[PDB]
Write a structure and sequence with these properties.
The complex is a heterodimer.
Chain A: H1 6-40
Chain B: H1 5-37
């Protein structure tokens, strides 16, 4: 390890990057609703 | 039948949403690597 503190700070920065990629999938999932709702309409 | 050409375009959009599942799972695997050194 290194100092049980400098390595712990790196884990908090990696968790913030997962929220950005996860937020893009939530917005893309709602977009599918409009495309799935427009394709089901008569 | 009819009303099928619109269903073919939705299949292409699902391929981009399915790839996000592999990109979102790879991001969580990166943080797991830090635990091995934590």
């Amino acid at each position: 390890g290194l100092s049980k503190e400098e390595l712990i700070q790196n884990m908090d920065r990696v968790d913030r990057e997962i929220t950005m990629v996860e937020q893009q999938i939530s917005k893309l999932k709602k977009k599918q609703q409009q495309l799935e709702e427009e394709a089901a309409k008569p | 039948k009819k009303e099928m050409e619109e269903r073919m375009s939705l299949e292409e959009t699902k391929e981009q949403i399915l790839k996000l599942e592999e990109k979102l799972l790879a991001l969580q695997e990166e943080k797991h690597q830090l635990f091995l050194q934590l």
